[PDB]
């Protein structure tokens, strides 16, 4: 299948081989075992320009995990910002939730990210919402010890 | 001295016989093998973490190890990896020359002081560190035809009633069981558990506890109260030793009175210590045993050994329990070992047969039959006492070496009758001045050979071993045949030859020989003519020299390397790679589909299939296999179409059509190494795995930009795979008075297995596991099944105080001198060498990110003395006919008949093919040696003339040519016909006697047609400049 | 195993030197079958038992 | 060096060439006697 060879360009990060894939339309909506998409791989891994160019065709903006996890979560967990932003703008839902109540959010807010965290509150995301746990962006901010986000999300 | 053994026939008898039985009891008390010691010392640190990932392994096992191996000896270098398959292995190796057991000794201490700073686990499982660079003289597998036990059941049997045995068997050293002794196994259930609240914690605890050595006292013991009769010793609780009594272990007692016992929350059973592994042989349940042959040990008296001793032990073997042998190195040693004795053998007798040819009597074709053996025995015992053995190597060394051998025996019977036959001497005074003309010249010749083959045994390292083999075999025949050629041959002409008429030269006689003396005495008139006419254009010649040595240049440059030949072992194997995250299952299709291919379009080649799923010499797992193939004989599969080579390439071009996964065959090594480079790419900073990855990416891409000069070049390790990370909230566990400690207990016994105690089956301690049946462990929605029992006494579900999401990490993490690595192979492109595709790679890796560095590994160090040596080598010769002649110029005439031999080597492997090996290279230089040896003769016959009658430039060229020409042809054609069943030679260690065929044929034939013509064209040339 | 066999618990320094401190029966309480039941344990709640 | 440190209070400071490349006596507690007596012996 043409679908794992993306799979593997997607997550090693060549665009040159991805963009070949494109041409001959291998499968945008490939998964493994996991669930992971050619762009959770790309998001996770942060490369934008295979983003971009998986968005252009036709790629589940809200693809789910087998545990309910998505781009935009990959995206915020990790430190990518621009991932972030060209996510959202396609779509990408700010307010998603993981089978254990994780949003984008939380993974920012969990991680740091001050500068992911201002651009997901400016897109609606909930300063409401509790994970499993009931921990809300605040929670996860003040036990983490951190002051700044602390300000930010209050 | 000739003259002394000339007045002392019986004295010099002595010497050959003392010299004979020296060498009898040598090749009696001498260790036959296929190959020496050639691999640098390696110790291996093998340890296992039941259950642990490549992670976890790395950074409590791997790193705590590694930063200890400090104030060893002689370290070259260190490697070492962490699988997920919770094992880890640290690969020393050591400075060629080492004793290997020092250096064990030095790794093992060291180990053990840090044995305190590692898990608790990884210390009950235990710590292995052993000599690695040993091979398998053969491995023993063990079927069961009847389809009435397991691999586990055939495992235990071997262990407990055949490993033992055959390692106390005569002449092996060790022996590897491929497989595991029984374990008890408890497989829990967690519906069951929970339902009794209960937890793996409680279940460790009890067997813990009913399943223990208690230690207690005696009865009267000392000091006892006087008046004490009797002194017996207490025996309390002792290890269990059945299945039954497991199962009747107690664990909790309801307070309604039934009781819990082990047997009502788990099924409790016999099984293996692990199952990542399952092996087959045709499709049937295998184990097996790999055995090493012990130092200074006979493979063959030790191959028998062992079948005997099996024999010994069948009629003791379960019901449809038979052993086969997928794997033997003894059949090569066979075959190597008959086939020098058959050469040696019909070399004897084409002496004899050219010996009579030409000169016609059977007293003198009868020395040489004498002269060669009693040199041949008598090199065994210079072998012997150097420490050397019989093997491949110095087998071929002495086949090469008869040519010298049955040289030096010709060319002293010769001279003696051609001197008889020129005047009326009787041999006792026709052998003293037949010696006093070549007595100088032969001691002359052992100096120039030595000075030839000795400096080769200064290599280092590995390549080193190889040379020192030849190399000092060649030059121990060569320097003992020159001492009988000045003992034994002046003795054995001087009593065996009878009178010859001068005049005499058989010319009128009867019949053949009458006429082959009439058309070789008129063969040896148009020869000096011709030389005659040669003499009158020397300028006409010296050009068509320089176009021989130019033609040589060109076809020596163009002449592709390998280090050894390649052959048909009988055996290959077929490497298979499923993707990530596939299932054992999965990968045993792969493999039946693979073995059924071998079994049906290959049944008339291929005799068994040896399937190992889950092994790789670069990564295991449940993704990987490997299937070692077994050939039938060489008599049963006949021409190339149904070699190795020819049967790889069509398995390999079958199993593409597999979209599963990626199946290829491939022969093996020739010794177990390849060509190509062993880069290192290594994390100099603190930069991680990721950014190590990107580093070796980028690197792989831009040597994907120079298909001229890289080809092939690719990791040698696993791709990083998803994993599923499991996050326990400390805060709702506290909350619930759940134990961090039972959650890691009832998680880590559950999913990884945990190995509890030790038992007795059948008086044998054997280990006891305890984990989870298997369908309630296999999917991420299994783990909310688990309930872990808090302080309030209720039971608390793993989705309760915890999340999971999917992550990437590694299968298997390298390091290399204690710094993260990764591994990359690659080989030069077609036509540049080695040493220029390094200096490329030193290049690309020179533009990496900031933080990485790079090393050279194996056969890539160790890597540049040829031409040192063979510059020292050309001085000590030149000084050596300097003094033999007593002139700075004269020398020069002898060490120009070089490239007469090396043209001719370099046309045959051109043309049929072959490389430029080890065994073409020793070829040459036994061709140069004879060749110099004949030119050494000539221009002392000719110097001699000129000295002593005072005989003219040209009439002392032309007589000594004349006098050289028998002798020179006769031990040509003799060498030529012993050399040829080598050159067609096919199957059975073919690659190696074609290499020693083609190599000296080829350049025997142009050595001896175009020296006869030069070599008197040089001396001249030479004597009018100087 | 601490009263019929005798434990060994710690070291002690005896003059300087370090030697061993052991925890064994009177010989007169471990010398017959029968003095097996003399020794007592303590159970959970207290209560001692043969 | 040596002598422009014995100068220095409290304090043991010596400069010394490394011998390329005196007694050295050793007292020894035969009995039981203990450190602080093993001291008076050597005071």
């Given amino acids: ?154 | 001295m000739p003259n002394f053994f000339i007045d002392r026939p019986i004295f010099a008898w002595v010497i050959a016989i003392i010299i004979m039985l020296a060498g009898g009891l040598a090749i009696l008390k001498l260790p036959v093998a296929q190959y020496p010691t050639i691999a640098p010392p390696a110790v291996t640190i093998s340890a296992s973490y039941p259950g642990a990932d490549a992670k976890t392994v790395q950074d409590t096992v791997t790193q705590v190890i590694e930063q200890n191996m400090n104030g060893i000896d002689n370290l070259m270098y260190m490697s070492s990896n962490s699988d997920s398959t919770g094992t880890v292995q640290i690969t020393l190796t050591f400075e060629s020359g080492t004793d290997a057991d020092i250096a064990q000794v030095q790794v093992q201490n060291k180990l053990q002081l840090a044995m305190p700073l590692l898990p608790q686990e990884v210390q009950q499982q235990g710590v292995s560190v052993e000599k690695s660079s040993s091979s398998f003289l053969m491995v023993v597998g063990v079927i069961n035809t009847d389809g009435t036990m397991t691999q586990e059941d055939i495992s235990d049997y071997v262990a407990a009633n055949m490993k033992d045995a055959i390692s106390r068997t005569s002449g092996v050293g060790d022996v590897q069981l491929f497989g595991s002794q029984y374990a008890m196994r408890i497989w829990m259930n967690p519906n069951e558990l929970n339902k009794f609240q209960l937890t793996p914690v409680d279940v460790i605890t009890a067997i813990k506890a009913q399943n223990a050595q208690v230690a207690a006292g005696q009865l009267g013991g000392t000091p006892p109260v006087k008046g004490q009769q009797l002194n017996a010793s207490i025996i309390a609780q002792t290890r269990l030793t059945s299945t039954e009594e497991f199962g009747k272990i107690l664990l909790k007692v309801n307070q309604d009175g039934s009781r819990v016992l082990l047997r009502d929350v788990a099924k409790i059973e016999l099984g293996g210590e692990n199952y990542d592994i399952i092996a087959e042989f045709n499709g049937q349940p295998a184990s097996g045993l790999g055995i090493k042959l012990a130092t200074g040990a006979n493979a063959l008296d030790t191959a028998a050994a062992i079948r005997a001793e099996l024999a010994k032990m069948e009629p003791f073997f379960p019901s449809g329990l038979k052993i086969v042998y997928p794997y033997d190195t003894t059949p090569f040693v066979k075959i190597s070992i008959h086939e020098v004795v058959k050469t040696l053998v019909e070399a004897i007798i084409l002496v004899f047969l050219v010996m009579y040819l030409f000169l016609q009597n059977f007293r003198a074709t009868l020395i040489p039959t004498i002269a060669v053996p009693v040199v041949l025995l008598g090199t065994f015992a210079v072998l012997a006492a150097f420490g050397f053995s019989i093997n491949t190597l110095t087998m071929f060394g002495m086949v090469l070496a008869i040519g010298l051998l049955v040289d030096d025996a010709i060319v002293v019977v010769e001279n003696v009758e051609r001197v008889m036959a020129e005047e009326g001497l009787p041999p006792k005074e026709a052998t003293r001045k037949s010696m006093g003309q070549i007595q100088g010249a032969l001691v002359g010749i052992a100096m120039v050979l030595s000075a030839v083959f000795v400096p080769m045994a200064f290599f280092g390292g590995s390549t080193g071993a190889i040379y020192r083999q030849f190399s000092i075999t060649i030059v121990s025949a060569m320097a003992l045949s020159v001492l009988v050629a000045l003992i034994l041959t002046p003795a054995l002409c001087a009593t065996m030859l009878k009178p010859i008429a001068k005049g005499d030269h058989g010319e009128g006689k009867k019949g053949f020989f009458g006429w082959f003396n009439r058309m070789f005495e008129k063969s040896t008139h148009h020869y000096t003519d011709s030389v005659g006419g040669i003499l009158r254009s020397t300028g006409r010649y010296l050009v068509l020299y320089l176009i021989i040595v130019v033609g040589m240049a060109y076809l020596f440059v163009r002449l592709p390397s390998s280090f050894l030949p390649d052959e048909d072992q009988g055996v290959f194997m077929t490497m298979v790679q499923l993707p990530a995250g596939a299932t054992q299952e999965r990968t045993q299709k792969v493999l039946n589909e693979v073995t059924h291919y071998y079994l049906t379009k290959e049944k008339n080649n291929v005799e068994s299939v040896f399937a190992v799923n889950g092994f790789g010499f670069a990564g295991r797992g449940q993704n990987t296999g490997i299937a070692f193939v077994s050939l039938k004989d060489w008599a049963d599969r006949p021409g190339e179409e149904n070699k190795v080579e020819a049967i790889t390439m069509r398995a390999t071009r079958a199993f593409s059509q597999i979209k599963d996964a990626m199946v290829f065959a491939f022969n093996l090594p020739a010794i177990v190494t390849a060509t190509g480079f062993d880069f290192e790419l290594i994390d100099q900073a603190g930069l991680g795995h990721e950014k190590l990855t990107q580093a070796r990416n980028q690197l792989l891409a831009e040597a994907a930009k120079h298909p001229d000069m890289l080809t092939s070049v690719r990791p040698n390790g696993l791709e990083d795979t998803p994993q599923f990370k499991i996050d326990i909230d400390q805060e709702k566990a506290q909350a619930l008075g759940v134990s961090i400690n039972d959650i890691n207990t009832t998680l880590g016994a559950a999913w990884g297995g945990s190995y509890v105690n030790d038992f007795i089956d059948r008086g044998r301690v054997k280990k006891v596991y305890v984990m989870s049946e298997a369908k309630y462990r296999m999917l991420p929605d299994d783990i909310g099944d688990w309930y872990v029992r808090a302080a309030d006494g209720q039971m608390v579900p793993f989705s309760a105080f915890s999340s999971s999401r999917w992550e990437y990490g590694s299968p298997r993490l390298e390091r290399y001198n204690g710094l993260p690595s990764m591994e990359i192979l690659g080989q030069a492109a077609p036509g540049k060498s080695t040493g220029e595709a390094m200096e490329l790679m030193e290049q690309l890796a020179s533009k990496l990110p900031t933080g990485v560095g790079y090393d050279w590994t194996g056969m890539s160090y160790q890597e540049n003395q040829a031409p040192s040596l063979y510059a020292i080598s050309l001085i000590v010769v030149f000084l050596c006919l300097a003094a033999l002649y007593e002139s700075w110029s004269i020398p020069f005439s002898v060490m120009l008949v070089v490239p007469l031999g090396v043209i001719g080597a370099l046309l045959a492997a051109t043309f049929r093919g072959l490389t430029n090996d080890v065994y073409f290279q020793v070829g040459l230089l036994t061709t140069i040696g004879l060749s110099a040896k004949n030119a050494i003769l000539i221009v002392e016959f000719a110097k001699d003339l000129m000295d002593k009658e005072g005989k003219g430039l040209i009439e002392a060229t032309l007589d000594a040519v004349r006098m050289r020409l028998r002798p020179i042809l006769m031990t040509s054609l003799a060498f030529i016909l012993g050399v040829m069943p080598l050159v067609i030679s096919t199957g059975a260690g073919s690659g190696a006697q074609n290499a020693v065929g083609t190599g000296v044929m080829g350049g025997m034939v142009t050595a001896t047609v175009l020296a006869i013509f030069f070599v008197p064209v040089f001396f001249v040339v030479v004597r009018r400049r100087f």
Avoid: C, Y
Wanted: net charge negative; charged share 25%; aromatic share 4%.
């Fill in chain 1, 1 to 154: 299948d043409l679908g794992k060879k993306l799979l593997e360009a997607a997550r090693a990060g060549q665009d040159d081989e991805v963009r070949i894939l494109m041409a001959n339309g291998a499968d945008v909506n490939a998964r493994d075992f996991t669930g992971w998409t050619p762009l959770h791989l790309a998001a996770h891994f942060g490369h934008l320009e295979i983003v971009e160019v998986l968005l252009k065709n036709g790629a589940d903006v809200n693809a789910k995990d087998s545990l309910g996890v998505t781009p935009l979560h990959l995206a915020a967990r990790r430190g990518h910002l621009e991932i972030v932003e060209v996510l959202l703008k396609n779509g990408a839902d700010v307010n998603a939730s993981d089978s254990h109540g994780f949003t984008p959010l939380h993974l920012a807010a969990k991680r740091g990210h001050l500068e992911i965290v201002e651009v997901l509150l400016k897109n609606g995301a909930d300063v409401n919402a509790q994970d499993k746990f009931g921990k809300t962006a605040f929670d996860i901010s003040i036990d983490n010890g951190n002051e700044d986000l602390a300000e930010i999300l209050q």
